[PDB]
Design a protein around this ligand. Structure first.
Ligand SMILES: *[C@@H]1O[C@H](CO)[C@@H](O[C@@H]2O[C@H](CO)[C@@H](O[C@@H]3O[C@H](CO[C@H]4O[C@H](CO)[C@@H](O)[C@H](O[C@H]5O[C@H](CO)[C@@H](O)[C@H](O)[C@@H]5O)[C@@H]4O)[C@@H](O)[C@H](O[C@H]4O[C@H](CO)[C@@H](O)[C@H](O)[C@@H]4O)[C@@H]3O)[C@H](O)[C@H]2NC(C)=O)[C@H](O)[C@H]1NC(C)=O
Ligand SMILES: *[C@H]1O[C@H](CO)[C@@H](O[C@@H]2O[C@H](CO)[C@@H](O[C@@H]3O[C@H](CO[C@H]4O[C@H](CO)[C@@H](O)[C@H](O[C@H]5O[C@H](CO)[C@@H](O)[C@H](O)[C@@H]5O)[C@@H]4O)[C@@H](O)[C@H](O[C@H]4O[C@H](CO)[C@@H](O)[C@H](O)[C@@H]4O)[C@@H]3O)[C@H](O)[C@H]2NC(C)=O)[C@H](O)[C@H]1NC(C)=O
Ligand SMILES: *[C@@H]1O[C@H](CO)[C@@H](O[C@@H]2O[C@H](CO)[C@@H](O[C@@H]3O[C@H](CO[C@H]4O[C@H](CO)[C@@H](O)[C@H](O)[C@@H]4O)[C@@H](O)[C@H](O[C@H]4O[C@H](CO)[C@@H](O)[C@H](O)[C@@H]4O)[C@@H]3O)[C@H](O)[C@H]2NC(C)=O)[C@H](O)[C@H]1NC(C)=O
Ligand SMILES: *[C@@H]1O[C@H](CO)[C@@H](O[C@@H]2O[C@H](CO)[C@@H](O[C@@H]3O[C@H](CO[C@H]4O[C@H](CO)[C@@H](O)[C@H](O[C@H]5O[C@H](CO)[C@@H](O)[C@H](O)[C@@H]5O)[C@@H]4O)[C@@H](O)[C@H](O)[C@@H]3O)[C@H](O)[C@H]2NC(C)=O)[C@H](O)[C@H]1NC(C)=O
Ligand SMILES: *[C@@H]1O[C@H](CO)[C@@H](O[C@@H]2O[C@H](CO)[C@@H](O[C@@H]3O[C@H](CO)[C@@H](O)[C@H](O[C@H]4O[C@H](CO)[C@@H](O)[C@H](O)[C@@H]4O)[C@@H]3O)[C@H](O)[C@H]2NC(C)=O)[C@H](O)[C@H]1NC(C)=O
Ligand SMILES: *[C@@H]1O[C@H](CO)[C@@H](O[C@@H]2O[C@H](CO)[C@@H](O[C@@H]3O[C@H](CO)[C@@H](O)[C@H](O[C@H]4O[C@H](CO)[C@@H](O)[C@H](O)[C@@H]4O)[C@@H]3O)[C@H](O)[C@H]2NC(C)=O)[C@H](O)[C@H]1NC(C)=O
Ligand SMILES: *[C@@H]1O[C@H](CO)[C@@H](O[C@@H]2O[C@H](CO)[C@@H](O[C@@H]3O[C@H](CO)[C@@H](O)[C@H](O)[C@@H]3O)[C@H](O)[C@H]2NC(C)=O)[C@H](O)[C@H]1NC(C)=O
Ligand SMILES: *[C@@H]1O[C@H](CO)[C@@H](O[C@@H]2O[C@H](CO)[C@@H](O)[C@H](O)[C@H]2NC(C)=O)[C@H](O)[C@H]1NC(C)=O
Ligand SMILES: *[C@@H]1O[C@H](CO)[C@@H](O)[C@H](O)[C@H]1NC(C)=O
Ligand SMILES: *[C@@H]1O[C@H](CO)[C@@H](O)[C@H](O)[C@H]1NC(C)=O
Length: 1171
């Protein structure tokens, strides 16, 4: 569905109201007043707006000339009131000292607009909604129609009354309009602001928010100023009341109003709405039918009426309770107690006069003790509190007793609240939230339910929106319908839809309509699971919370089939579809198809109740495991090798599989080892292997080798063992020694027995991977594969001739020395004399255990201790070299003795290991900031030696980058205290020092001045920067943060104090700098780890928008915008206008460039160029 809507094409909207007969919607706006249909189509548009005028002018230009300058200004609709009696609309504007309009009801024809007399003027105030009031009428000939109206005054105390009682004549042209009900030279039916109270408190004013007629009175919810709370402005939200029949204005009352939530004050009215409570809230709030109630909205505190806080609270007042607070206060002043206490009205406090009277609710005020205030602030019952999104508006209504509340939000959202304090629940609960102007257009106070009370017109700054009170049809399921709780919604069982009682046909009958989730349609089928192969199966259906279906019912499995059913007891009996019908469904979905079996009612003809119904298919299972150990009742036939539901369809009795453990499967043994090109049998074990029956062949082993697949026939010895016959196998590659191969055991040609563990045959080759004795004895003792001296190759005893009783050698337990060790290459080629180096030797024919190579390794004379974990047997030794300080040699060859330094069992390295002692002499900055982060370049000799390197400045470690013969480059850590620091480099067990080469911690560079204090949006101009220690940073750069973007640019250092920098581009398509200029969010410099320089607090650097220049003996004149910026001091751009290469002498002006020419033209200023 879509929300019916009226969009405000050009201007903001201010007020909305609904005609109780028609449902036409009238809409007050700035410069416009619209008539709209119930579904928000435009019906008529009145122009009321842009008027040539001025607020300062009294009587507006129409009546008298004003010396103040006039301008086309907007006319804001301040007020809107339906006068049904005189078939019209009072449409009160502003911007003419507040003259009022009369528009005819059905066409908006201006009937009248009185503006001659002073009463025809209402207020200068140009603010929308700060005004309110009520229209009240009697029959024609009797006491005529009156308007009670409050407005702000703006300090124009003597021009306008804030509250007034005014006359509404039947002729709109009649001059008597908006005249006071009773005017006297002593007392008029109006209430003015006293001049003395405006002198004392400068801009006190009364803003009228909401207003309503009740029984015989007229109430107003108001906002006022600090008068006992010159200083600052703080507001107090109050209730006002008058008797309708009090021309003298003596009935005026004024009590402060608000409410508190866990010690948090809410004292600013944003809206209100008088309503009924209906049977529900009335009863447990203790009220009579026609007793009224007032829903309200307050913001937190007493601050900023112009822009209130998010924190907002919906409170409640029963009018009987406000009536009692007023009666209680009057029966109190008529006891003579205290003062009247009304600051803004009576500055000097007059006292309460005692008198004997019958104080009633009918009391309409008397001559003495006059207009009076209120001491005890009236507290309201809180209901719902929003903390992240401020309430703005409210309405409410009676629905079948339960009291529904509507609440606008700053976001453009409406809340639908059941108030349940008087209802059973713990506290009043939100039911639902809805969207109007999602982008964040706030909802306005004027929020009216339609006449039929089916919709709720919700107004924003920019759009009216028809939001339905009931729209239960968005609810798809009984479970969600009654789950939303918004009380209009019930499940109309047989129509399977969610809607109100009056909308569900026959709802009054038993079980036809559901209102509590427990009434939900609940359905079950006895034979939940039915096989594809079955047909017309009898099923029984149990359903609860369903009306009398003696009308008739059909079963529809989905929109595929439909079978007739008959009714007995509390059960429904229908049949499954035919095999002819069932399979059209199940085709494609294979294993099973869960299908939603519905009930189609004969009365409605709509599916309402559902169940999970399963269509299972046994035959499509193509293995025992899937068949039995699946999820369903399926039987496997060992012998036919087919899955089916029927026991009898099996071959015969003793071939039925019902249990998963009884399935034909191959069991594992310890791994199947198969050498290539060797005649071997492969015995297998298994379980429940079938005796092949009539017309059935025997067993075979099929090997799935990509190169060659072998078919070898086998013998089944019993139900538990197999064996493929003597054969040899191969694969073409010689690429991988150990190849695992999928094998399938077949019988009768194509029946493959199940292989759960997925047992494989490993085809291994006596080595196509190992041409070294050490590699063979390295591999599995299982393979039986071993090294054969004479051949110079490696194969089994089987494949190698015994010319000697010990000609074939196998690693017995690894106690097998292996001949002629050889070293290929070793890493680190160089090392420190001190030792500690990890030598990484890689050979081919080494020892097979660690404890023989340990003690064997030596570097010339120097004892080398080998490492266990890092040793890879007969391929690689990792060894730690000892102290070589005492060695005379500079370089020595590496030696391994396998176990004993025997003459055949020794290896010597092809090239030799070199000992050096690295030294360093210079550092390439010798200075750097205390924070660190400096790129250091240590120069020396032999710096690339050994394994590990660690550089320590002041004991603290340097972050290493890269190493060289001649250089070590690392990044400096933070220094503790500024000044000279030791540089310690340790390579393995060698720790080299130099006290002549030190590092000097500085002092951190500083930034003092940037000279020009500005640049343009694209940047690129020269900046003459000054500071200290600038030569100690090799690559400094400028940083600037504009908006959400951060950008950087380069610098060129000259002195320790001077630097030229190219200004950073801030080019943002989101924000452009103004003509006036703008500071960046951040500005600074990136200098290593000195982070205090990244953000400059004191900087006044400005960014102007991207010079503008216009193209095509007398001098050159070049015109354009943005040539000169509004910069502090003298400082301006050094412009140079050039011709091919020759610069000119020019005088620069704000719009023009005065170059001088003797008769390709380029203009330069910093990093800027244009032709
Ligand atoms: C429950 O589930 C079962 C199994 O999943 C469904 O039964 C299948 O029905 C469909 C028909 O729509 C079959 O698919 C078609 O197969 C034919 C050729 O089938 C041949 O190959 C089979 C596969 O090995 C083999 O089983 C067949 O032998 C059977 O039939 C004989 C005689 O009745 C019987 O004695 C045997 O015991 C077997 O039962 C047969 O040799 C093929 O023409 C189709 O392929 C074409 O279309 C596809 C898709 O467009 C396309 O990709 C191809 O290129 C080709 O053009 C098609 O695949 C399927 O074979 C049946 N399954 C089995 C095991 O037989 C069935 O939906 C459900 N059962 C019921 C009762 O509803
Ligand atoms: C290290 O190197 C840096 C930059 O490389 C040096 O900074 C500059 O030094 C030179 C001298 O070596 C100075 O140039 C001289 O300027 C004067 C006239 O100054 C006027 O013109 C300037 C250039 O347009 C302008 O910036 C000046 O504005 C400054 O002063 C105002 C007001 O006091 C101040 O508010 C600003 O902040 C500016 O700082 C000013 O209007 C000129 O007379 C010199 O000419 C002489 O020298 C040349 C060459 O030797 C010779 O040929 C002539 O005959 C003549 O005798 C010269 O052009 C420049 O002022 C320095 N820049 C700054 C920003 O101060 C820096 O001095 C070196 N540092 C160290 C520690 O050694
Ligand atoms: C289903 O059918 C399967 C397969 O047909 C049977 O499995 C066989 O079980 C028997 C036990 O009866 C196993 O027989 C044993 O074989 C050993 C032979 O290994 C040697 O083979 C060759 C040639 O002799 C040598 O070169 C090689 O070096 C091996 O050493 C014998 O050593 C065993 O004999 C020992 O046990 C018996 C009985 O206790 C004693 O009498 C002997 O003195 C001796 O101690 C033994 O005979 C045979 O390996 C299995 N077959 C296969 C093919 O592997 C199942 O028994 C049967 N299952 C059921 C439930 O009925
Ligand atoms: C497929 O659909 C069928 C619909 O028929 C579902 O079957 C029902 O499954 C549930 C459990 O999953 C059973 O509920 C249990 O009942 C137990 C008591 O069982 C006895 O009483 C049964 C009814 O009175 C009776 O059917 C049953 O006899 C069965 O066993 C006999 C011996 O094996 C066999 O010969 C008969 O044919 C028959 O099948 C017992 O005497 C109780 O102890 C449990 O706590 C539980 O409540 C239903 O009884 C099943 N209904 C039937 C008619 O058997 C089935 O769930 C669906 N399959 C899947 C996978 O979802
Ligand atoms: C102005 O607003 C009015 C209402 O304020 C509105 O006119 C109404 O439209 C509704 C439908 O939106 C109509 O209600 C129909 O009543 C007839 C019986 O006479 C039914 O046959 C209709 O049922 C149909 O629609 C159902 C729901 O979509 C279907 O389930 C069903 O199969 C039928 O097709 C329906 O209930 C109604 O005619 C008027 N209301 C009145 C009082 O006449 C309209 O949307 C707005 N018009 C304009 C010009 O802006
Ligand atoms: C509840 O269930 C009952 C019984 O299960 C079911 O009755 C069905 O009624 C339809 C008529 O609506 C029957 O279909 C007819 O059968 C004749 C042959 O005898 C066909 O030639 C007709 O089919 C034509 O029309 C179809 C629909 O327009 C087309 O799809 C088709 O191409 C043909 O032109 C005709 O429809 C049907 O035989 C019975 N069902 C059975 C199982 O016999 C009924 O739907 C349900 N009852 C109610 C009141 O809804
Ligand atoms: C040797 O056998 C192995 C294992 O049987 C084969 O590898 C894998 O085979 C399995 C079948 O069990 C495949 O798994 C499948 O996964 C999908 C997941 O979407 C699932 O839907 C299927 O039901 C099935 O279980 C798997 O794809 C396959 N592996 C690869 C990488 O394809 C292997 O194919 C055999 N080797 C050769 C050379 O054929
Ligand atoms: C066959 O069914 C068995 C028994 O139900 C399944 O056994 C599972 O085995 C794993 C071990 O791999 C256990 O951790 C699970 O707890 C077992 N599951 C259950 C439910 O008992 C097995 O998954 C099924 N196998 C196949 C191939 O379908
Ligand atoms: C072949 O297998 C048979 C039976 O297992 C056995 O007697 C014979 O030793 C095997 N022959 C060869 C050459 O391996
Ligand atoms: C270290 O640097 C500081 C600040 O630049 C300097 O004053 C001091 O002389 C330097 N120390 C040495 C030993 O040169």
């Amino acid at each position: 569905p879509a929300f019916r809507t009226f969009v405000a094409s050009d201007w903001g909207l201010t007020h909305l109201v609904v005609h109780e007969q028609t449902g036409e919607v009238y809409v007050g706006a700035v410069n416009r007043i619209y008539k709209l249909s119930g579904n928000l189509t435009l019906l008529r548009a009145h122009v009321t707006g842009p008027v040539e005028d001025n607020e300062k002018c009294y009587p507006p230009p129409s009546v008298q000339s004003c010396p103040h300058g006039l301008g086309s200004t907007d006319n804001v609709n301040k007020l809107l009131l339906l006068d049904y009696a005189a078939n019209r609309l009072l449409a009160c504007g502003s911007a003419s000292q507040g003259i009022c309009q009369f528009l005819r009801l059905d066409d908006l024809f201006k009937l009248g607009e009185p503006h001659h007399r002073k009463e025809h003027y209402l207020s200068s105030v140009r603010e929308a909604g700060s005004m309110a009031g009520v229209l009240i009428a009697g029959p024609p000939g009797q006491g005529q129609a009156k308007l009670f109206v409050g407005t702000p005054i703006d300090g124009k105390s003597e021009y306008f009354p804030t509250l007034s009682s005014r006359r509404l004549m039947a002729n709109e042209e009649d001059a008597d309009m908006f005249g006071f009900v009773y005017q006297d030279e002593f007392v008029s039916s109006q209430l003015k602001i006293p001049s003395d109270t405006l002198s004392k408190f400068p801009a006190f004013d009364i803003y009228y928010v909401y207003s309503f007629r009740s029984e015989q009175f007229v109430y107003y919810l108001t906002l006022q100023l600090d008068t006992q709370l010159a200083g600052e402005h703080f507001f107090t939200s109050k209730i006002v009341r008058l008797c309708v029949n009090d021309p003298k204005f003596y009935s005026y009352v004024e009590f402060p109003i608000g409410c508190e939530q866990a010690g948090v004050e809410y004292r600013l009215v944003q809206d209100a709405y008088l309503s009924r409570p209906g049977q529900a809230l009335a009863k447990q709030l203790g009220l009579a039918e026609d007793e009224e109630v007032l829903f309200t909205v307050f913001a937190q505190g007493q601050k900023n009426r112009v822009k209130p806080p998010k924190e907002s609270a919906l409170c409640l007042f029963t009018l009987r309770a406000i009536k009692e607070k007023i009666k209680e206060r009057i029966q109190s002043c008529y006891r003579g107690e205290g003062k009247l206490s009304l600051p803004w009205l009576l500055n000097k406090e007059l006292g309460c006069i005692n008198s004997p009277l019958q104080i009633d609710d009918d009391f309409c005020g008397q001559d003495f003790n006059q207009p009076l205030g209120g001491t005890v602030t009236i507290e309201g019952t809180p209901l719902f509190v929003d903390k992240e999104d401020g309430l703005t508006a409210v309405a409410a209504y009676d629905y079948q007793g339960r009291t529904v509340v509507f609440a606008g939000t700053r976001s453009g959202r409406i809340r639908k609240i059941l108030v349940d304090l008087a209802n059973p629940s713990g506290r009043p609960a939100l039911a639902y939230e809805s969207v109007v102007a999602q982008e964040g257009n706030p909802i306005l106070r004027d929020l009216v339910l339609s006449p039929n009370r089916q919709y709720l017109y919700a107004m924003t700054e920019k759009q009216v929106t028809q939001v339905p009170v009931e729209s239960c049809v968005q609810y798809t399921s009984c479970e969600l319908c009654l789950g939303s709780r918004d009380p209009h919604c019930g499940w109309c069982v047989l129509h399977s839809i969610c809607s109100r009682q009056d909308a569900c046909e026959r709802a009054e009958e038993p079980q036809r309509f559901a209102s509590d989730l427990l009434q939900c349609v609940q359905l079950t089928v006895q034979p939940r699971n039915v096989s594809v192969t079955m047909s017309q199966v009898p099923l029984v259906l149990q359903a609860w919370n369903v009306p009398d279906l003696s009308a008739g019912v059909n079963c529809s499995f989905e929109d595929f089939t439909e079978t007739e059913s008959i009714l007995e007891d509390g059960r429904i009996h229908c049949h499954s579809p035919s095999a002819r019908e069932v399979a059209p469904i199940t085709q494609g979905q294979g294993d099973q198809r869960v299908v939603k079996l519905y009930l189609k009612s004969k009365e409605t003809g709509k599916k309402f109740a559902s169940v999970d119904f399963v269509f299972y298919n046994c035959s499509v299972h193509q293995s025992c495991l899937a068949c039995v150990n699946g999820s369903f009742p399926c039987h496997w036939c060992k012998y036919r090798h087919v899955c089916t539901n029927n026991a009898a369809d099996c071959a015969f009795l003793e071939g039925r599989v019902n249990m998963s453990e009884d399935c034909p499967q191959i069991l594992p043994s310890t791994h199947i080892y198969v050498p290539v090109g060797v005649v071997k049998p492969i015995t297998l074990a298994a379980r429940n292997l079938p005796q092949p029956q009539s017309g059935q062949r025997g067993y075979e082993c099929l090997f799935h080798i990509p190169g060659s697949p072998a078919r070898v026939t086998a013998l089944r010895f019993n139900s538990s063992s197999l064996q493929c016959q003597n054969s040899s196998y191969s694969y073409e590659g010689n690429d991988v020694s150990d190849l695992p191969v999928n094998l399938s055991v077949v019988w009768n040609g194509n029946f493959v027995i199940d292989n759960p563990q997925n047992i494989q045959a490993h085809l291994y080759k006596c080595p196509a991977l190992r041409q070294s004795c050490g590699l063979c004895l390295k591999a599995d003792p299982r393979f039986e594969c071993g090294w054969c001296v004479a051949e110079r190759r490696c194969s089994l005893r089987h494949h190698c001739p015994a010319d000697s009783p010990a000609s074939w050698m196998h690693a017995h337990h690894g106690s097998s020395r292996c001949t002629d060790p050889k070293i290929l290459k070793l890493s680190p080629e160089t090392g420190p004399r001190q030792g500690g180096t990890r030598l990484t030797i890689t050979g081919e024919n080494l020892g097979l255990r660690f404890e023989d190579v340990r003690l064997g390794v030596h570097v010339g004379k120097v004892l080398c201790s080998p490492v266990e974990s890092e040793y890879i047997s007969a391929e690689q030794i990792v060894c730690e070299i000892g102290d070589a300080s005492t060695l005379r040699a500079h370089d020595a060859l590496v030696e391994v003795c396998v176990r004993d330094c025997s003459l055949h069992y020794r290896a010597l390295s092809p090239k030799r290991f070199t000992f050096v002692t690295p030294t360093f002499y210079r550092v390439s900055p010798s200075r750097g900031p205390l924070s660190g982060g400096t790129w250091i370049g240590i120069e020396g000799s032999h710096l690339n030696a050994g394994s590990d390197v660690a550089v320590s400045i002041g004991g603290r470690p340097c972050s290493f980058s890269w190493r060289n013969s001649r250089e070590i480059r690392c990044l400096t850590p933070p220094g503790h205290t500024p000044g000279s620091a030791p540089i310690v480099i340790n390579i393995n067990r060698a720790q080299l020092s130099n006290p002549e080469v030190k590092y000097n911690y500085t002092e951190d560079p500083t930034i003092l001045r940037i000279d020009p204090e500005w640049s343009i949006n694209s940047g690129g101009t020269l900046l003459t920067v000054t500071g200290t220690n600038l030569a100690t940073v090799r690559e400094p750069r400028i940083r600037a943060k504009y908006g959400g973007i951060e950008r950087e640019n380069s610098c060129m250092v000259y002195n320790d104090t001077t630097m030229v920098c190219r200004a950073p581009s801030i080019d943002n398509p989101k924000r452009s700098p103004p003509e006036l200029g703008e500071r960046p969010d951040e500005i600074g410099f990136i200098m290593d780890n000195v982070r205090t320089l990244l953000v400059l607090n004191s900087s006044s650097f400005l960014y102007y928008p991207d010079p503008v220049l216009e193209p095509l003996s007398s001098p050159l004149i070049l015109k354009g915008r943005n040539l000169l910026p509004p910069a502090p001091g003298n400082s301006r751009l050094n412009y140079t206008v050039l011709i091919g290469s020759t610069p000119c002498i020019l005088t620069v002006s704000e719009t023009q460039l005065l170059c001088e020419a003797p008769n390709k033209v380029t203009v330069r200023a910093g990093g800027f160029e244009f032709s």
